[PDB]
Paper text:
Here we identify and characterise a sub-family of multi-centre photoreceptors, termed photocobilins, that use [name] and biliverdin (BV) to sense light across the visible spectrum. We have identified and characterised two types of photocobilins, one from [name] (SasPcob) that represents a standalone photocobilin photoreceptor and a more complex protein that consists of a photocobilin diguanylate cyclase (DGC) fusion from Acidimicrobiaceae bacterium (AbDPcob) that is representative of a photocobilin domain fused to an enzyme domain. Crystal structures reveal close juxtaposition of the [name] and BV chromophores, an arrangement that facilitates optical coupling. Light-triggered conversion of the [name] affects quaternary structure, in turn leading to light-activation of associated enzyme domains.
In order to investigate the effects of illumination on the photocobilins, we determined the light-exposed SasPcob crystal structure. Similar to CarH, the SasPcob light state corresponds to a monomeric species, with the [name]-binding domain dimer interface disrupted by the light-triggered release of the adenosine group. However, the SasPcob light state structure lacks the drastic large-scale domain repositioning that accompanies formation of a bis-His ligated cobalamin in CarH. Instead, more modest changes occur at the adenosine binding pocket in SasPcob culminating with the formation of a water/hydroxide ligated Co(III)balamin. While the majority of the Rossmann and globin binding domains are relatively unperturbed, the N-terminal four helix bundle adapts to the removal of the adenosine through changes in the position of the Glu71/His72 containing helix. The C-alpha displacement of ~2.4 Å at the Glu71/His72 region is such that, when superposed on the corresponding dark SasPcob dimer, it would lead to a severe clash at the dimer interface. Therefore, we postulate that rearrangement of the adenosine binding pocket in response to illumination occurs concomitantly with monomer formation.
Residue numbers in the entry: 6 to 216, 221 to 346
Write the structure that this text describes.
Amino acid sequence: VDILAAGREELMAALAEGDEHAAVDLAMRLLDGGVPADVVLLELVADAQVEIGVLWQANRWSVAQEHAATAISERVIAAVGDRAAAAPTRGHVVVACLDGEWHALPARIVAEVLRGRGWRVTFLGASVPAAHLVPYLEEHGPDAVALSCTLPRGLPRADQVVAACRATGTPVLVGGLGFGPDGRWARVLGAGTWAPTARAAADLLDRPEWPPAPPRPADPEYAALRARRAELVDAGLAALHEWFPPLRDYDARRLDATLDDLGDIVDHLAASVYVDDPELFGEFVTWTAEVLAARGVSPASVEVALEAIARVLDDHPRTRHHLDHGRRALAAHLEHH
Ligand code: B12
Ligand SMILES: C=CC1=C(C)/C(=C/c2[nH]c(/C=C3N=C(/C=C4\NC(=O)C(C)=C4C=C)C(C)=C\3CCC(=O)O)c(CCC(=O)O)c2C)NC1=O
């Protein structure tokens, strides 16, 4: 009687169909049967969300489905979290998404698991500016701040926000997909203490030791990518005009989508360079190829843009390595698909 495997399928069906009654009731029945709340949130809800991500990437997930499924998940997490909340005896943890980060569900799961272990949690929500977060810490003096980052493109900003929080004397936890496999990009930056899940985060806070770091060498190549972003986007676009025939026939909507995506390409290259890990840019490029291909856009367009960006930045040595690796990963992806 693998109740978890059965539950996983039932929840996914409810989310995909927008059935809020079935989803919330399933969560309540699991708790009725003594299934731990952190199991419901991590092995069921989080897992269903991963699969939704896969459907979305493959262009099999509508706007209407996003709203319905996210709203239901908010309700599930709220009901489970409140039900399993323990007496707030241990202290106070502030939880926040980075500025420009709208993936609040992972952070809310962290918040609820912590409540379930006796922490008072203030959840400051999605996209919290440091200008708001830092004063909050200085006057409330929580035992810890937990910063969530899901998008690797947010890593440079993460590094800044972490440092600003540390300057308050507040111990910093970090997590989310944005810090990469095994938190490798958290470790590169020496950013707070990373943990893979809410359960692991709570376990960290049970350690008796309870887990101003100078090393931050100037990165001029990173700064050049920020400063020259529009130039690089334009070079991308010009190369696509020349060498990517379908672009000539694009309406305004499609030119705008192209410009947005070119901007993201530059931003992910910047993040890659910032943490000195071309694998960031590599995995981003091959992911982009799948995203575009599933929407009828030839991923050969990406090679045209990357090659053009590479010409402009050919005298930027680290950056041209990142670009080489991206284009190489793309080529291998397109041969091997
Ligand atoms: C739902 C969703 C959205 C929702 C989020 C709504 C909300 N309230 O959260 C909305 C619709 C807003 C959205 C928008 C976008 N998203 Co989205 N989406 C997702 C999705 C499907 C699930 C998110 C989720 O619930 N995760 C919950 C579970 C799965 O997360 P988890 O990692 O197990 O959580 C644990 C750890 O992260 C850890 N943790 C997290 N934070 C912290 C903090 C601390 C301190 C600690 C210790 C631990 C910790 O603990 C958690 C709990 O155990 C994911 C797919 C995915 N794989 O995550 C994408 C995904 C993250 N989204 C993606 C994208 C691209 C987007 C958009 C850019 C798309 C667009 N619109 O152009 C935007 C960007 C918004 C932004 N600026 O942030 C991509 C990103 C890939 C990339 N980096 O390039 C993903 C991976 C989907 C995909 N397969 O392509 N998204
Ligand atoms: C280099 C050449 C290049 C071209 C020519 C390009 C074109 C391009 N991308 C599109 C959509 C898209 N492109 C993306 C890609 C992303 N969304 C994200 O959040 C992130 C980070 C990415 C990846 C970079 C998505 C998600 C869509 C569909 C979503 C939408 O715009 O509604 C579309 C519209 C598809 C359609 O509806 O007809 C076009 C024409 N993108 C390129 O990168």
